[PDB]
Amino acid sequence: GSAVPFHGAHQAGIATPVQDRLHFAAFDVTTEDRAAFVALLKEWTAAARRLTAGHAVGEGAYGGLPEAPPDDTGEALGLKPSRLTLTIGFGPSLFTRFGLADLRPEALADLPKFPGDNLDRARSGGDLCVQACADDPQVAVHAIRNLARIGFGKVVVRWSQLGFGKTSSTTPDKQTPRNLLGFKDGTRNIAGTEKDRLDRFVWAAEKDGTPWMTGGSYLVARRIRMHIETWDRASLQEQEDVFGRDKGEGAPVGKAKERDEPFLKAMKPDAHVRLAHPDSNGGATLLRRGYSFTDGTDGLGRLDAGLFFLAYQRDIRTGFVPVQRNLATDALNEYIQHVGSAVFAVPPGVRDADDWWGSTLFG
């Protein structure tokens, strides 16, 4: 497939097929003027319609008046749409502007402090996010660079993260990706095909309390560093006991195949799968949509690598919070550290050509 439709009851980039690459950006708002911000949301929506179809923004990247800057910065000319999706979300800090304080959803809860948190304030929070997913990373970067340019004077970029999953040209669609610890990652997840499970666990409903959010969802982002060089010194048995699945096949202990249902009593009590499973958490179930990262090496020569964890849910209080609380004693905690965090309310979809991002909130 080459393009993903932009219009719908829901924003694309949640339940639509998982693309190979991510560019995730958090923005802070610099204007106090509600009218100026609405004008920007309409201009951004018009740009997103062009970008997700493989077209340049505005009048184009070349062929305009020579004495004017081009409307599009030009680095995606000649590339394909690449399944680009652009998903916008609103942080709790936006609701302190524009008279919105009584329209913050109760489901957009502030996260508690969790044991072992080491959060960098500069790579946490944000008034707004745009999640750009595509199979070509230059298509994703071009989208973020041009939205930031259109918004200059009204928004600034607070923090940015590049990520990667599978490379689809060489890797079959059905094959579970491996994370940078070398384990299969995504076996037991909500799939975009499971319409009733998305209604139960992912999409906000009208009766949940906040009518503007009907058909939206709630996003938790966590930048999780892995202690790669410590993990690589652990024995094979220590690594498998941390998860409760074997490394080669990814089967649950005492089973033969990856997709065999787990028997939780055969795993160690503090194994990651046993603690995270819905049966250990009162039925709490998440849509995981995260990406691996490798940013470089730190000052000590260690690899700056890990998982940029993204979870979508109907209510932060009944999805991420109870599951992450249950990981207080996870055997995996020896090898990871949460170093960035943010939460966002992801509004409903853009219904047609005349609609715009945030129209249910702003009017």
Next chain:
Amino acid sequence: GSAVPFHGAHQAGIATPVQDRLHFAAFDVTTEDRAAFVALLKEWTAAARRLTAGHAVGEGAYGGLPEAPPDDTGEALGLKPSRLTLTIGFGPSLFTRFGLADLRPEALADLPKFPGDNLDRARSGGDLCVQACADDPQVAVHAIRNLARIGFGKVVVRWSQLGFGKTSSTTPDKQTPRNLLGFKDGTRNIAGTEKDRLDRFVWAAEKDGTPWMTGGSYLVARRIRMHIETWDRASLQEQEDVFGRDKGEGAPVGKAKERDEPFLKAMKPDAHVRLAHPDSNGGATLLRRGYSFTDGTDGLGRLDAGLFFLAYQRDIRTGFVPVQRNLATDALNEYIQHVGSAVFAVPPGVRDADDWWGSTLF
């Protein structure tokens, strides 16, 4: 997803078609034992033969003794070779160790200071490098991680650079990629099929004065920050005048097609193409093989963006140095800053299964 052959008279990853992704690492040596360093070069060569064919290193990623760490870290299981190449180079600082002082090639020149340089010493230099290029970033990270692990106690990573997309071409028959300024980059390079031009401008020859380097090359690496706020407010005419080519087609000024030959006298006297062209530099010609990068935000509300510039040449003194000296008046200097630098001697190819990286030096 196909394999690139590892053995040859030359190392792969130079004339080879340019792959989508880069992971570049520079290492410093921490052992004084020559025999221990030779043992590492042989173990690294054996690992490279496995990794470039899509196999796990050593005894594999699982199914060994439960109480031992796996020989391979496992995150490339089930992936194709993805055109992985692994290219090793030796920095000038290596030749102060192991009694190698008299074997440093004359062509491995230290670079002069250039006007506008702001070089970070921590992300410059290095005793040696490994260039990993592949179409899958996970395959490239797995290769660098496993080499670093094998080298524990003998080498440490000094600095690394990931490139998310290529800004170079050795295949003129395929689409030329764009850099983050929005211009095609790679039109007039050296192609992998141009055997005469590779022998003249890229490969070191026995007669050049350093027999152990015959069939090798010399690498310059420059980390270049781009002033994208400043560039994005420039007019279309300003952008095109900086280069001497139009933005949409990438043709030389006045001409209709990308690959039409430049007419230099129609360009501004400070245009990048006019100053960099071989005819402006006594014939000096380079093989360019760079990649784009973005390392987050700059903490001032903007995306960080740059180009990791890589050039291969027969002699640094006759390749990169004269061309970069001629760029002192380039219109492009308003929009870039060099912030990292390193040079390396890239030895000849691994001839067969009994040969090893660096065997002609050691």
